[PDB]
Amino acid sequence: SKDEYFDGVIRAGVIATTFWGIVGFLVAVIIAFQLAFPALNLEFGNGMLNFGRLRPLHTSAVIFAFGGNALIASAFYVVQRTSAARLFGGTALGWFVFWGWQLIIVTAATSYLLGGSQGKEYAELNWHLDILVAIVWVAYLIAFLGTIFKRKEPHIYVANWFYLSFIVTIAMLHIVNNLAVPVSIFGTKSVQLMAGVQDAMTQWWYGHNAVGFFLTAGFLGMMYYFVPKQAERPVYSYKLSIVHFWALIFLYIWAGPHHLHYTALPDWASTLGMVMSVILWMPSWGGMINGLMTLSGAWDKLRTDPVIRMMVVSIGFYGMSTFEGPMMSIKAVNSLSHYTDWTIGHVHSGALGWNGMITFGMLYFLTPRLWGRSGLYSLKLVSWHFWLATIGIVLYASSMWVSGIMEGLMWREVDAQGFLVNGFADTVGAKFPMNVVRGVGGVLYLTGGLIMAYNLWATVAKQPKTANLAV
Amino acid sequence: MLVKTHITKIGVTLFAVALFYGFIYMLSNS
Amino acid sequence: VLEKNATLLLIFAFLVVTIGGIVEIAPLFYLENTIEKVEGMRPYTPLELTGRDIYIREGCYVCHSQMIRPMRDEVERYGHYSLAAESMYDHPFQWGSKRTGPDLARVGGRYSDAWHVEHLSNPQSVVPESVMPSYSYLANVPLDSTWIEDRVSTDALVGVPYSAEMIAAATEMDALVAYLQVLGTMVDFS
Amino acid sequence: TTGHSWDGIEELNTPLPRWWLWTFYATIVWGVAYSIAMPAATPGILGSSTRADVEKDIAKFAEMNKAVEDKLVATDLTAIAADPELVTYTRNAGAAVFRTWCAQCHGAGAGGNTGFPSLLDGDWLHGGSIETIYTNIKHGIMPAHLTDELLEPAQIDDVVQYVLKISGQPADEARATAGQQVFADNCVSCHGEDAKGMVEMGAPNLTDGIWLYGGDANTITTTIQLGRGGVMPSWSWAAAQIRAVASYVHSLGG
Amino acid sequence: LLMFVAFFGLIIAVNVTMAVQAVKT
Ligand code: HEC
Ligand code: HEC
Ligand code: HEC
Ligand code: HEC
Ligand code: HEC
Ligand SMILES: [Cu+2]
């Protein structure tokens, strides 16, 4: 039997997705405030709040915990339905992935503030945690790929192409970038296998591809399932799906050196990164086109359905960032952009605008269904959430652009006499209003997250036994 | 739709000129 | 097609995804420019190595870059643009990604130890406008150096030229200052 | 539309958008062009282009502003402070250079703080002359009496009180007699008697007015106990600029 | 809806502007 879809894990992951979203974004707001007012840092005593330590916590919680859980819930729901079979690992393998993932985030929460970090971005957790994550991910791929193997229909939905790719590539990236000799039990009590330029390359190959697969590909899978899930029928382009997918999947791995522009990294590598990052523009947009064009005719729905609003706007930000990224990947542009708040602007445009928004919409869609509910408790709240999230994202982006341009310019600016026009401190001071506005925008987005939490909770209350009949 | 592509053309000059101003101000700052 | 075939799709994906990594990462292992240390350079002294770990633990990297780009203005501000050879020993590499604070790569003497102590103790005190967090605990905690030998041994395994003699021979604030003082020094003296 | 449905979802067989195609192809073409043009070429740079552009940037900068610096170098530091052409451009830019390099220790104002000298004022530890200031800048930069058996716990207190009297007048009679005697013995050698101080040593005058230095009895006790040990790092490596800065610092007082 | 389209076009215009300015430079 077991004809019914295993909703179990998806339910757990969805709720946790909301929870981690709140935790991660709140850390985001707090650290932002710390940039605005350093007092928020403990003056005497490292303690609980210190920016250097908290920052990676924000990073990991937001990406792996929030984004990660979103990916788990979405992939488990989506693959099951798209292929029409009950999850291959079942409660056992899949639930293991749930608890295991939970353990991973919990360990991050304890470990990071404690000070144990490799110092490698998006890599920060210590080796023991790395082994745990590798194990959980291995289990996760078996469940997912197994689900595909067990499918009913002969064809495999493109959404699964993206999810599947994301799964495999992240595993490879994680293993490779994490090679390190353990000196001690924890924290970064390991030293990376590589050093210098090589370490930088491995790091950014890993680092970009992280957003590339974890944040883009996997989420593209989400978009592929959820955007078309609507009352309106067909409008899409399958051939684009094919071109866009392969081209993206191939091209994206080359993008690593754009991080490294005008650094110690050899010129040839930097160039390869730039060129491929520019080629990357097309496939990435292919995703957005495929998503948006699908809406055509359907647009009237946008006023009606806020979940749709979220998905659509999500693609808008996605395209924007996928455009801005290639531009910043040009050496001349990077010359200005690098080390400035602009990089952050770019990150949150994609993070809040693309990743968060699509996952949000995804959850609003799925959680009622998984919960054995016709719909969310209040649509109005989804709308309010939509607005809060949108203004917050835009405010964040605007502030960062102003700050970033100001910083790059101020840093580079030379006088008539040839001397440096501004002290670094002057640039720092210039940045303050930007820091505050950013703090506010992020705060608003966070509030939207709270509204989501309230709404979801209300809906969650309704029924025990929410097997949703056959499905 | 014509409304869609039109409102697509709308505003483009706005950000275009805003950012060209931004870049003149930038090369003016650096 | 290959739409239908799970194994084929998986294999092609793994293959497609691999090319960039093989093309970019692998050749670097082989290239000498990125491998060769500056001639003068030696590995971090045990105090400096410990301090570097502290710099890692604290999260200094999150605000401070250690990579000078080859532009005139940054050369003017920071000093000689960073060279691959400088980072040869760095497991893991410290190059920044963000400059909330200024670039640290070449503070090969720029400030006195005393200044560093006061500043780390309370950045606002020395630099009123600073965003930097206060790190007074550094003064509070002493180093046991139990682990230092293990750390150097591991680094040697990794290729760092520590002598047996170096291992045998080997406050946190002291270590951090020691680390900061070495940065970028290797190139200038050599 | 295509025949197979994936739970609700069906997909249209549609063509790639022409513009999308064009952009994709264009990017590819640009990439090939870039690679041929970059490392694998472009004209303008002999050999092969690289980060080598750095040299060009510096070189053109040098051509453009070499004259200004070169003119200044011939001129003496005193002259470079006076003259608003070089001299005034030397204060604003020297002042420009000052902010970037010196401000973090000596204050944006150049007024200084505890542990760092006030460059604006009249008082100079190493000497106010142009040569002295220049030397301070170019080549860069107090004995622990607590230990020297004789000084001890009490001797230090006494000497501190006496110095505060040289600087002004507090009231502590034991802390005065003893201190006078000690100062004449030891301190006076570097700080002189009546604390004129000696510029050669960088020993500051004890007969000063209220400055930023820890005048308090306790602070004086600490400096006497433990001694000083302050450094002015050399700008000869890091820094022409040193000269303009000397001209600026000199201009600062007057 | 039309507001989202307007914002999207605005972003695209900002982008083309950035390209021009970088070629300036
Ligand atoms: C922190 C590491 C400093 C740097 C950066 C700069 N200065 Fe400095 N300077 C510093 C100290 C602690 C002292 C006092 C040293 C002592 O005798 O205890 C000084 C002294 C000077 C002087 C001499 C002043 C005098 O009384 O004769 C000069 C002229 C001076 N400093 C100039 C100067 C310039 C131009 C700087 C930027 C290039 C600069 N200093 C940086 C501490 C520090
Ligand atoms: C984020 C906020 C940080 C944190 C995590 C660190 N620093 Fe910094 N730092 C920051 C700013 C905004 C500034 C400029 C203002 C100031 O000088 O106080 C600095 C400065 C420094 C400097 C001086 C650099 C120079 O002027 O050449 C040093 C040496 C420095 N910071 C060191 C340092 C260390 C060791 C850190 C980890 C404990 C650290 N910083 C963290 C902002 C931030
Ligand atoms: C020989 C060298 C001596 C000896 C024998 C004494 N002093 Fe000290 N002193 C000396 C120098 C070069 C400096 C400057 C230190 C620095 O700038 O880092 C000082 C400084 C002091 C100060 C501090 C002045 C201030 O607050 O800025 C004091 C209070 C002082 N010296 C006192 C002092 C006393 C009481 C001595 C006899 C016990 C004495 N000095 C001897 C150089 C030298
Ligand atoms: C991926 C999802 C994601 C979400 C959602 C997110 N962030 Fe972040 N955040 C990141 C990443 C990635 C970085 C690291 C950027 C870097 O290393 O350049 C970061 C870094 C930051 C920083 C450090 C900035 C600096 O200059 O060092 C702040 C502040 C911040 N985020 C605030 C926020 C706020 C406020 C929110 C409010 C919702 C938020 N974040 C939500 C991903 C996210
Ligand atoms: C989350 C959504 C997201 C999307 C979508 C995205 N990136 Fe980024 N981008 C990031 C993050 C996170 C960083 C910061 C990495 C770091 O910490 O240095 C970044 C930084 C960058 C930088 C600046 C690196 C530096 O330090 O100067 C470039 C260039 C870049 N990305 C290119 C791209 C390209 C090319 C694409 C797609 C074609 C893209 N981005 C899409 C998240 C994203
Ligand atoms: Cu990247």
Residue numbers in the entry:
A (entry chain n): 57 to 527
B (entry chain Y): 1 to 30
C (entry chain o): 9 to 178, 215 to 234
D (entry chain p): 13 to 52, 60 to 160, 174 to 271, 281 to 295
E (entry chain h): 11 to 35
What do the paper's sentences say?
CIII2 is a dimer with each monomer comprised of three subunits: the Rieske FeS (FeS) protein with a [2Fe-2S] cluster, cyt b with hemes bH and bL, and cyt c1 with heme c1 cofactors. The FeS protein external domain (FeS-ED) is mobile between the b (close to heme bL) and c (close to heme c1) positions. In R. capsulatus, both the diffusible cyt c2 and the membrane-anchored cyt cy carry electrons from CIII2 to CIV in respiration. Here we report the cryo-electron microscopic (cryo-EM) structure of this functional bc1-cbb3-type SC (CIII2CIV, at 5.2 Å resolution), together with three structural conformers of native CIII2 (at 3.3–4.2 Å resolution).
The bipartite SC preparations (fraction A-1) were supplemented with either purified full-length cyt cy or its soluble variant lacking the TMH (i.e., cyt S-cy)32 to yield the bipartite SC + cy and SC + S-cy samples. Following SEC, the elution fractions showed that only the intact cyt cy, but not the cyt S-cy, remained associated with the SC. The cryo-EM analyses of the bipartite SC + cy yielded a map (SC-2A, EMD-22227) at 5.2 Å resolution, with local resolutions ranging from 4.3 to 8.0 Å. A clear difference between the maps SC-2A (bipartite CIII2CIV + cy) and SC-1A (tripartite CIII2CIV) was seen at the interface. The unidentified TMHs were barely visible in SC-1A but highly enhanced in SC-2A, indicating higher occupancy. The observation that only the native cyt cy binds to bipartite SC via its TMH suggested that the TMH next to CcoH TMH (blue in Fig. 2e) corresponds to the membrane anchor of cyt cy. Indeed, landmark densities corresponding to the helix-breaking Gly11 and the correctly spaced bulky side chains of Phe15 and Tyr21 of cyt cy TMH (NH2-xxxGly11xxxPhe15xxxxxTyr21-COOH) were discerned. Thus the TMH close to CcoN TMH9 (blue TMH) is tentatively assigned to the assembly factor CcoH. Moreover, upon addition of cyt cy, the predominant conformation of CIV in the bipartite CIII2CIV + cy (SC-2A) shifted toward that seen in map SC-1A of tripartite SC, with no major class corresponding to SC-1B. This suggested that local interactions between the CcoH and cyt cy TMHs and CIV decreased the interface flexibility of CIII2CIV.
